A paper describes a structure:
Bacteriophage Casadabanvirus [name], from the order Caudoviricetes, is a temperate phage that infects the bacterium Pseudomonas aeruginosa. The virion of bacteriophage [name] is composed of an icosahedral capsid, long flexible non-contractile tail, and a baseplate. Using its baseplate, [name] attaches to Pseudomonas aeruginosa via the bacterial type IV pilus, whose subsequent retraction brings the phage to the bacterial cell surface.
Here we present the structures of the virion and empty particle of siphophage [name] resolved using cryo-electron microscopy. The icosahedral capsid of bacteriophage [name] is built from 415 copies of major capsid proteins organised in a T7 laevo lattice. The capsid of [name] is formed by pentamers and hexamers of major capsid proteins. These pores were suggested to serve for water and ion passage during genome packaging and ejection, and putative scaffold protein release during capsid maturation.
Author numbering:
A (entry chain B), B (entry chain C): 2 to 51
The structure:
């Protein structure tokens, strides 16, 4: 006649991490639509002739 | 010739086991819809991070 706190609830229970980091995020797709340009200062300026 | 119909008429037979295992049962399928998580106590508690 063990008291409920020390029962299947807590005393008899094993922790498992099968659900961890299983639901993923949508795959990255920004490369297909955008291109990467590096920078090394506060801003970047672009110019073309015509 | 003449004989009781409970000895010869009963023993003039050849038992065969063709009918055994003639049919089958539906194949296992729960693998395609479930994973197997072994347990070592009364219950298993699961926890994952957000």
């Amino acid at each position: 006649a063990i008291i409920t706190p020390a029962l299947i609830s807590a005393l008899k229970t094993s922790f498992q991490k099968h659900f961890q980091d299983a639901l993923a995020t949508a795959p990255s797709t920004y490369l297909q639509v955008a291109t990467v340009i590096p920078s090394t200062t506060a801003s970047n300026t672009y110019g073309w002739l015509g």
